[PDB]
Amino acid sequence: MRSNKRQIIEKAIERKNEIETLPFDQNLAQLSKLNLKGETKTKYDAMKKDNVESTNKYLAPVEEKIHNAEALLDKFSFNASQSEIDDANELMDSYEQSYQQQLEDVNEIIALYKDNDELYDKCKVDYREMKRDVLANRHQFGEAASLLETEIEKFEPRLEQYEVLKADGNYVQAHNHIAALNEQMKQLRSYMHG
C-alpha cells in the first residue's frame, strides 16, 4: 500500500522541480526594456525582494514537508503523510499564485507605458489643432481670444514635462500628468465651440 502512496509523493517532487523553473526573471527583465529608473525601478526592486520573501516563505519549506511525508508513510502514518503532502501542495499553490501576480503586475506596467504614449500622441495633435484654430480664426472667437492664445501656449511646457517624467521612468506620474492634460485640453475644446 505504501508503494502506491509513494506515487502521490513523487507527483509532488515533480511539481516542486518544475515550479523551480518558473521564469520570474525573464518576466521582470521586460521592465528593463523600458526606462529602468524612478518608479519603474522602484517596482522592479520591490518585486525582486518579494521573490526572496516568497521563495523562503513558500518554496524552501516544501522540501521538508515532503521528507516528513516519506518518513511518516514508512511508519504507516497514512493520513499524517497525506497531510504533509496537502500542505506541500498548498505552499506550491501560493508560489504559483505569486508568479501569476507578477505576470499581471508587469503587464500592467507595459500597458501604462503604451497607454501613456497613446495619450501623449493625442495631446500633441490636439495642441497643434487648437493653436492653429486660434491663429487662423482669431476674429471668430471675439474678445476671449488672447486668453485662449496664452492658455493653449500653457499646454506646450506640459507636453515637454511628460517627456521628462517618462524618460525618468516615472510611469505613474507620467500617466496622471498626461491624463490631466488631456482632460483640460478636452474641456477647452468644448468651450471653443463659440
Author numbering: 23 to 216
Verbatim from the authors:
EzrA comprises a single, N-terminal trans-membrane (TM) spanning helix followed by an ~60-kDa cytoplasmic domain15, which sequence analysis suggests forms an α-helical coiled-coil. The BsEzrA22–562 and the shorter SaEzrA24–214 rods comprise multiple copies of the same ~100 amino acid, triple helical bundle; BsEzrA22–562 contains five such repeats and SaEzrA24–214 contains just two.
To obtain higher resolution structural information on EzrA, several fragments from different EzrA homologues were subjected to crystallization. A 190 residue N-terminal fragment of S. aureus EzrA, SaEzrA24–214 (that also lacks its N-terminal TM helix), yielded crystals that diffracted to 2.6 Å resolution. The conserved proline in helix 1 of repeat 1 (Pro45 in S. aureus EzrA) may confer some additional flexibility in the junction between the body of the cytoplasmic domain and the membrane.
